[PDB]
Design a protein around this nucleic acid. Sequence first.
RNA 1: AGGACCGAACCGACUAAUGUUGAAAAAUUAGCGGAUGACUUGUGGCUGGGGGUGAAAGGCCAAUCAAACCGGGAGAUAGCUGGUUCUCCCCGAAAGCUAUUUAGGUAGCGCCUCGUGAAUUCAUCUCCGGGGGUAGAGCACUGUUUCGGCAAGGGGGUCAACCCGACUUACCAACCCGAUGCAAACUGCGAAUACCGGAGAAUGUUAUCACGGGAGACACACGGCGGGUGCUAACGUCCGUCGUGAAGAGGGAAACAACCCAGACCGCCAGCUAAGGUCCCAAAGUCAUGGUUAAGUGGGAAACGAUGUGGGAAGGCCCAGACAGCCAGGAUGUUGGCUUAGAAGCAGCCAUCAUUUAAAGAAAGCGUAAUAGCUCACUGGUCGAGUCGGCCUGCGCGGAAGAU
RNA 2: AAUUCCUUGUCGGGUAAGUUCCGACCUGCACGAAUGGCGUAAUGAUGGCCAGGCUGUCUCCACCCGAGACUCAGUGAAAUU
RNA 3: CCUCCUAAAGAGUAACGGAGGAGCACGAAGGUUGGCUAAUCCUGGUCGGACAUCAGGAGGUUAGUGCAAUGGCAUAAGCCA
RNA 4: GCUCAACGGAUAAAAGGUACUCCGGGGAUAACAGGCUGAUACCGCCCAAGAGUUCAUAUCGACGGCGGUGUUUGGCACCUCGAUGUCGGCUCAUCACAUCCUGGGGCUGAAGUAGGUCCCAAGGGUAUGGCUGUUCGCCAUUUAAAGUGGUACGCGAGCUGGGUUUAGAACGUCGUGAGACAGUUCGGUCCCUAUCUGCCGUGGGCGCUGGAGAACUGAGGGGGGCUGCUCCUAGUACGAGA
RNA 5: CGCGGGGUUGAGCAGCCUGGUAGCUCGUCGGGCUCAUAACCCGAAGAUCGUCGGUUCAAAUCCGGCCCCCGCAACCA
RNA 6: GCCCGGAUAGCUCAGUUGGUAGAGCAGGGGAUUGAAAAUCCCCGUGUCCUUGGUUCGAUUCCGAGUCCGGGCACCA
RNA 7: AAAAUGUUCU
Lengths: 136, 77, 166, 38
Amino acid sequence: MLQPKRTKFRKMHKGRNRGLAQGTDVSFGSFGLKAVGRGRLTARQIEAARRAMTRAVKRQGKIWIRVFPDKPITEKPLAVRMGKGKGNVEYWVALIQPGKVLYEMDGVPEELAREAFKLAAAKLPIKTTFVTKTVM
Amino acid sequence: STRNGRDSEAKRLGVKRFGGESVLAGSIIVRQRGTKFHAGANVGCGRDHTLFAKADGKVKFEVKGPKNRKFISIEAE
Amino acid sequence: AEEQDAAALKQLQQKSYTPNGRVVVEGVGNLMHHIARCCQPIPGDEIVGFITQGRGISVHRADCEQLAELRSHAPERIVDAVWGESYSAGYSLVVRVVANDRSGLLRDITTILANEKVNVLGVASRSDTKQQLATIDMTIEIYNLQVLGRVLGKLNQVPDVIDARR
Amino acid sequence: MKVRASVKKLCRNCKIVKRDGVIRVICSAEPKHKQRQG
RNA sequence: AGGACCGAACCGACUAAUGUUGAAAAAUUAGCGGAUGACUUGUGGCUGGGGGUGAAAGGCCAAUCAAACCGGGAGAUAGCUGGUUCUCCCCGAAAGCUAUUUAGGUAGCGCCUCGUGAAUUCAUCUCCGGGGGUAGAGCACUGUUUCGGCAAGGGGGUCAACCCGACUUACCAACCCGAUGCAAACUGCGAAUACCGGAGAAUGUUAUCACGGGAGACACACGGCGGGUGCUAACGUCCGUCGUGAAGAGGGAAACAACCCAGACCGCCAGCUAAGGUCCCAAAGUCAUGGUUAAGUGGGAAACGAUGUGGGAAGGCCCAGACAGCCAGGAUGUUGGCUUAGAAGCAGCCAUCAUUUAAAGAAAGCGUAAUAGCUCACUGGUCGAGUCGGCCUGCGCGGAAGAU
RNA sequence: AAUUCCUUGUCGGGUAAGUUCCGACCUGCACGAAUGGCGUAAUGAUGGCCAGGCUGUCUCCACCCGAGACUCAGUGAAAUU
RNA sequence: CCUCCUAAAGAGUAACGGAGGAGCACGAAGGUUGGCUAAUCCUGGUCGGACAUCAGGAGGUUAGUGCAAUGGCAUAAGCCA
RNA sequence: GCUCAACGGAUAAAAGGUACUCCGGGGAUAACAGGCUGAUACCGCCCAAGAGUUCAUAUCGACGGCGGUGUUUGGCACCUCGAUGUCGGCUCAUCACAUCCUGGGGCUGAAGUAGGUCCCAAGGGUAUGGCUGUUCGCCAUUUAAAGUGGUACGCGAGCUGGGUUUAGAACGUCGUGAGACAGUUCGGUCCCUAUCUGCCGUGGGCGCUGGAGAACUGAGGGGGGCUGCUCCUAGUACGAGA
RNA sequence: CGCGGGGUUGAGCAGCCUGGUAGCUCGUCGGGCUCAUAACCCGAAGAUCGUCGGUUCAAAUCCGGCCCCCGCAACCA
RNA sequence: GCCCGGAUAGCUCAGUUGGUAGAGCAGGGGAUUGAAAAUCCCCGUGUCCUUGGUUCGAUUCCGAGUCCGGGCACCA
RNA sequence: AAAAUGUUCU
Ligand SMILES: [Mg+2]
Ligand SMILES: [Mg+2]
Ligand SMILES: [Mg+2]
Ligand SMILES: [Mg+2]
Ligand SMILES: [Mg+2]
Ligand SMILES: [Mg+2]
Ligand SMILES: [Mg+2]
Ligand SMILES: [Mg+2]
Ligand SMILES: [Mg+2]
Ligand SMILES: [Mg+2]
Ligand SMILES: [Mg+2]
Ligand SMILES: [Mg+2]
Ligand SMILES: [Mg+2]
Ligand SMILES: [Mg+2]
Ligand SMILES: [Mg+2]
Ligand SMILES: [Mg+2]
Ligand SMILES: [Mg+2]
Ligand SMILES: [Mg+2]
Ligand SMILES: [Mg+2]
Ligand SMILES: [Mg+2]
Ligand SMILES: [Mg+2]
Ligand SMILES: [Mg+2]
Ligand SMILES: [Mg+2]
Ligand SMILES: [Mg+2]
Ligand SMILES: [Mg+2]
Ligand SMILES: [Mg+2]
Ligand SMILES: [Mg+2]
Ligand SMILES: [Mg+2]
Ligand SMILES: [Mg+2]
Ligand SMILES: [Mg+2]
Ligand SMILES: [Mg+2]
Ligand SMILES: [Mg+2]
Ligand SMILES: [Mg+2]
Ligand SMILES: [Mg+2]
Ligand SMILES: [Mg+2]
Ligand SMILES: [Mg+2]
Ligand SMILES: [Mg+2]
Ligand SMILES: [Mg+2]
Ligand SMILES: [Mg+2]
Ligand SMILES: [Mg+2]
Ligand SMILES: [Mg+2]
Ligand SMILES: [Mg+2]
Ligand SMILES: [Mg+2]
Ligand SMILES: [Mg+2]
Ligand SMILES: [Mg+2]
Ligand SMILES: [Mg+2]
Ligand SMILES: [Mg+2]
Ligand SMILES: [Mg+2]
Ligand SMILES: [Mg+2]
Ligand SMILES: [Mg+2]
Ligand SMILES: [Mg+2]
Ligand SMILES: [Mg+2]
Ligand SMILES: [Mg+2]
Ligand SMILES: [Mg+2]
Ligand SMILES: [Mg+2]
Ligand SMILES: [Mg+2]
Ligand SMILES: [Mg+2]
Ligand SMILES: [Mg+2]
Ligand SMILES: [Mg+2]
Ligand SMILES: [Mg+2]
Ligand SMILES: [Mg+2]
Ligand SMILES: [Mg+2]
Ligand SMILES: [Mg+2]
Ligand SMILES: [Mg+2]
Ligand SMILES: [Mg+2]
Ligand SMILES: [Mg+2]
Ligand SMILES: [Mg+2]
Ligand SMILES: [Mg+2]
Ligand SMILES: [Mg+2]
Ligand SMILES: [Mg+2]
Ligand SMILES: [Zn+2]
Ligand SMILES: [Zn+2]
C-alpha cells in the first residue's frame, strides 16, 4: 500500500476538498484516468486500481500513479465516546478534486488502455474519465 | 488519555499603530518576537523587539536596505 | 495459508537436498576446469575456456560477454573446445522464473519443480517491491538440454509464471 | 434469469431489449446469458 | 433418663393461596416447626438514647430506629425546588470573556437600563495612509511525493583471491539535473474581506466615550458562511463571524421556536406588495408563446446499468449502390516453421510473407485426440436511401425491500 | 468446589436428549488447615439432583358445587381529577 | 507557565483537538570595545579510519543561538579576544 | 521562609465506606426504552482477479467500489429522575418481507429423484422435549416447515418473578478496614374496584318524514384460505444401472 | 487497548537508575584430575543489550512508536 | 442378484478423468565392538491386486477376473 | 571434613 515512509505529524485535520486539481494533464504517459468526481482515494483503493490496470495490460507498457495517499485519516474504535483525543490513523488517503489525473499509461494500444482504466475505475469510489496526451 | 492539553496565553503581538497613525512619543507601534519590523527614524527597538515611538508624529512603514526589511519610521509632523 | 505451508516445505526439502570426460579442452581431456556462473554452459552452442592462473580453466559458453572482454584484454589464455563426452551428470542450470505474486504462487512453482527428475541444489528467492513480482533463481542439476527445455515448458504451464529463463 | 443492476451483452448473440420498462438481455445462443434489471 | 420421639392445648411462622382503598397499618385458610425445655406464659420489677438491650438482624427499645419520642436552640442552614397577588407607558439584555474547592453558584469587565457631563465623539459610504500572511497559489526552504536522466555508494559475478584494483551487470542505488503532486503545525508569492488611522459627504433623536445609580446574565438553541472533533455521522460536539429564536407575533415552508418573507401602538367589511403562490380542497392564471418528460418522473437516493427520449456543433462510409437482411466464395506454397507427446488458421512460440486474386488473417469465435467440420473478417451480386458511432448536454428509466 | 473467569473444562454415570446433579481428572484465573482443613452417623419447614408413588402441575381443558361478580330494593365509600 | 498550529491574513478565540518544552542556567553565557563568519562537499596529506587536526577550491547561513518551538538575528542577537 | 503544582493560593493541619442509608435537586446527567445518526451490524448491488476439467458470472467470488435497512454493537444526551417498571417465561397477539414450508417461475455445473441459486408470491401454516433464569445455543426426536425482523428488544393497571437490581448470610478474590466485584452462592412483599380512548359483547334514545308488522336487497365489514402420507397414472417418462 | 513493569551471552538475574566502564551465577568450549564419566581444578571464548525511528558528541541507558511478554483494571445502573 | 468403494517399499500410510512413487519407522552398509547399544557417517531397500484396452506417454481413465470393505435388494 | 556412578549379552 502507498503510504508516506516518514511524516512530520501523525494526525492531520479533515480539511476540505474544494477546488480543481493541479495534476490535470497527462504529463508522463499517453493515456490518463482523470477523476471527474470529487472525493478521496484511499491507499488500498489506489492499489486495487493499479492491480486491475497492470493486470489488464499484462505488464505491457508503463503505468504511473499520479495521486499519492499522503493524508492520514483517523478513526475511533467501536464503543468509544467522543472525547479522549483524536483517534488513531487507520488509513491514508489522497484528496481528489475534479481534474486530477489518477493514473497515466503508455506502451499500449488506446483501446487496451481504455479497457484497463475501466477496470481501474471500477475499483475507485470517484467518477473517472479517459484522457489523452494533448499537444500543449 | 491525551498528552496535548497545553497552550500558552496569547501575548497580543502585532501592530498597535498603523501607517499614517499619529502617535505620541512612548506609544508602542509594534509588539513582536523578532525584528519582523526594524526601528526606522524616530522609533526605538525595545528589549523584546517592541517598536515604540521616540517622538510625536505619524507612523510610517517602509521597506529598505539590500535585505528588504520592514522599517517603521515616524514622520515628525 | 496451506499454499504458504507447502512452499515452506518445498524450500526445506530443497535445503536438505543441498546439504572427468565432461569438458575436453582442445583435443586433450582431463584438464582442471570449471563452469563459470556468468553464463553456465551445458549442451550449449559451443564453449570457450579461459586458462586461469589458479583453479585451471573456467568454461564460459561461446559468445559470452565476460569471455569477450577477456579476449579483448588478452587472447592467449582463451582456448576454444568441444563439450567433451557429455558428463554423466552434466550439472548446472540456474533458472530465473519471474511471476506475479499471489497468496500461493511460489509454493506452486516449487511443487512443479519437484516430481520432475531434477536435483535442486539451491533456490534463491525474493519478492520485488517495484510491483508484487515474485522472482526466483533455482540452482538445479540435470542431464540434458532437452530435459531443461521440458522443465522450462512445465514451469511456463503454471499460468501465474510470467517468464522462465536462465 | 440473472437479475442484476447491470445487464450486459455477454456475447454477440446477446440482445438488449426493454419490456415493460425493464432492460433485459435475451440470447438465442446461450440461455444462461439472459438477464434482467432488478 | 432425655435441650429423645409422635402429637393437642401453649409458643412459633417454612410453603401456598387469599387478601393488598384488607375483615387485619402483617391477617386469614390450608397445611408446616417446637411442644419437659437454652420451653412457654401471667403479674410486678430493673436496664434510657451514642444510652439500653441484642443466641448479632444494625435487630429491638410503644405501628417511629445506622441513634426513640416530646419540648427548647429554632424562623438551624438549603449556592437547591417550588411559589411570589392590581394597571398603563418608555427603553431593553445575556447565556461571552476572566477567576473561582469553580463548573446549575458567585464576583469584575462585555451587553441592558436610569441619570449627569463631554468633544464633529461614533456609525454609513467615498479617496488616501497602513500592517498583514488566511483563501488561493507555489515547491527555493522544512518535509513528503511519482516518473525519467547521469550517477558516487553498496551488491553480484568475471579477471584475481595477499592485494592492487580492472572489467562489467535486465541487482539495488544517495547527491545533482529535468518533469509531477501534496502540507493545520512548509512559504523564494498572495488576494477578497476584516482591522487600525486620516480627510471628505449626506444621514442618524448622541447613535460614541466618561463618571454615577439599578440590574440581569454568565445552561443557550438552531440557520448561514470559516474551521477543529466525529465517520467531511448526529437535532452530535467545541470554537470564529453574522442571522433568527431566546425575548418576536403575522404570511409561506401541509403540520414545523431557530428555514424563507416580514418586525404586530390601537382601529377599519380600504388599497399596493414580500416570500410563496394562482384546477378543486383553498385567496389568485384551467394566462400567453416555444420547448421538454410519459416515468405519476414531478412527488426521496448512489456506484453501475441500458438502440428510453429530446437538442447541439463536428466526423466515417453514402445512387462509383452504403448499413441490415438474401445468395455464393472465404483458396494456393501449406501440415509456414518450430516446440511438443501431438499441434495440420486455432496448448503455445516465432515469423506473419508472397501467390492465383473480385477477395480470402499463416486466421476472430466455435469445433477435434490432432485432422476434418461449422460460422467470421474480406469479397462480388441481390436490394434501392440513408446509415454508422462517438461526445455534448436536457429530461427520464432501473438500481429502489419494513414493519398499525 | 457455596471457591473454577476461560467454562456448558474433559472424561464417566444418570436421561431418548442433562449449562443442574453425582463420580473422577487437576490446567486451584483466585482451595487449604481454629477469620480452621478434610471426613462425618444422627439431625434440618436448609440448598442441588435423581427415582417410585401419586396426582388437572401439564397435554387440555370439561363439567359440578358453593362465596363474590350480573339484576332488583336499602344503605353508601375511595384513590383520582 | 512558554512555543507552534487549530485561529477564518490586526488582537482575541474553544475542545479529554494536534504537536513539543519550562519550574532554570550563566559574575560570564552579563557590559562594552576590537576582530572574525558558518553546515556541508570535493580534491589532497603522518599514525587517522565513513568521523579528529592541516591545506586550497565549491558552498553561501543549509549552521549557530546555554535549553523547546516560533519569530528573529551578518550592522550579526553567531564565534573569538 | 510556601511541587500553597488543584499553581487567584478555602485551614497551619484531613482519607475511605454505605446494598443500612437519608434529605435537597436534575432528564442540566447515566442505566431502561423512544429520538437523531448509521462507524459497526445485517441485507443488497458495481467491478471481476481467479476457483469452478474447459469456461469470470451454474455456484463461488479476491483486491476494491457504491447503496439500503434501522436490525446488532455503538455514538449523541433531544424526550422522561414531582417514577416511562428491566431480562426470560407464560397468555394473547399484530404488522413487515429481507419467504422457512406451501404456490408460480427463470437459469443450472437441471437425465430422473433430489438439489443449488435467482425472480415473483405474505393466503394460510410455521414443533414437543432434555439442559440452562436464560433469550440464544447445544442435544434428542419430530415436522411440509420448524422463517427473519418490527411492534416500549409487543404485551407485569394481563399472570409469573426463575434472572438482573435493596436490606440477611456465605465462598472466592481486592481492600489495613468499613466494605466492594457485568464473580459466585443460598434467601428474599409484583398494589390498583377502569373515568376516557380502544376493543368484545349487548341494550336504550332519536332518526330514516303518517304509523305498524314482516320479508328482503346488499354499499360495506369480518371469517375462512395450512398441509402430510398412501394409492392410481407407472415401476411408465428419465436413467447404463441405482 | 486504559495503567504500570520487562524484553540484555544458550538460561536466569544484575546494569538502565539518570548517557559514556557488559557484570554475577549456571551453561558452553579447550585443557587437567580419573581406568572412564561425574564432581572438583585451571583457561577461554559469548552481547547491534526485542525491533524501528529519534535525540544527541554518543544510547543498553533518555524519548517516541511498533513486536512479544507479565501484571492490571476493565466498573454503577 | 445388483451396485458402489478399497487393493502402493518389510510394515504404517502419501500421493488420482494421465508424466516413471515418497514420509515415518524398520533394513542395509561402513567406522567400532566379541556383537551390540549409544555415537558417527552413507543408502530406497517397491510384482502400485494380476491380465488386457485407450494413448505420442498410464498408479490413476475403460474392460476383465481376483481379493477384501460396504450398501442395497431377495422368503420355496 | 568431602570421594556419586559404570549401557546390554558373553
Ligand atoms: Mg408481464
Ligand atoms: Mg423433645
Ligand atoms: Mg412474646
Ligand atoms: Mg421470632
Ligand atoms: Mg418463598
Ligand atoms: Mg387464626
Ligand atoms: Mg396456620
Ligand atoms: Mg412434636
Ligand atoms: Mg412484664
Ligand atoms: Mg438525646
Ligand atoms: Mg436524653
Ligand atoms: Mg448488614
Ligand atoms: Mg446523631
Ligand atoms: Mg440559633
Ligand atoms: Mg425551616
Ligand atoms: Mg423596543
Ligand atoms: Mg477555569
Ligand atoms: Mg450602568
Ligand atoms: Mg444615557
Ligand atoms: Mg490551501
Ligand atoms: Mg457558571
Ligand atoms: Mg456557559
Ligand atoms: Mg456549553
Ligand atoms: Mg455556543
Ligand atoms: Mg454558527
Ligand atoms: Mg446541539
Ligand atoms: Mg442573539
Ligand atoms: Mg414567528
Ligand atoms: Mg409561522
Ligand atoms: Mg414540509
Ligand atoms: Mg399554517
Ligand atoms: Mg411573486
Ligand atoms: Mg379558488
Ligand atoms: Mg393553460
Ligand atoms: Mg432513478
Ligand atoms: Mg477460587
Ligand atoms: Mg461456571
Ligand atoms: Mg427429569
Ligand atoms: Mg456429562
Ligand atoms: Mg431439572
Ligand atoms: Mg463434582
Ligand atoms: Mg477458605
Ligand atoms: Mg496454622
Ligand atoms: Mg487462619
Ligand atoms: Mg467450619
Ligand atoms: Mg431446627
Ligand atoms: Mg344496589
Ligand atoms: Mg489572529
Ligand atoms: Mg481574522
Ligand atoms: Mg579527507
Ligand atoms: Mg431522594
Ligand atoms: Mg430539558
Ligand atoms: Mg437509550
Ligand atoms: Mg428501533
Ligand atoms: Mg440505538
Ligand atoms: Mg437530556
Ligand atoms: Mg448539548
Ligand atoms: Mg422538577
Ligand atoms: Mg406525573
Ligand atoms: Mg419478495
Ligand atoms: Mg395475513
Ligand atoms: Mg383468495
Ligand atoms: Mg428449546
Ligand atoms: Mg419487551
Ligand atoms: Mg415480563
Ligand atoms: Mg402494560
Ligand atoms: Mg429471585
Ligand atoms: Mg449483605
Ligand atoms: Mg399483578
Ligand atoms: Mg372477503
Ligand atoms: Zn560465461
Ligand atoms: Zn448469449
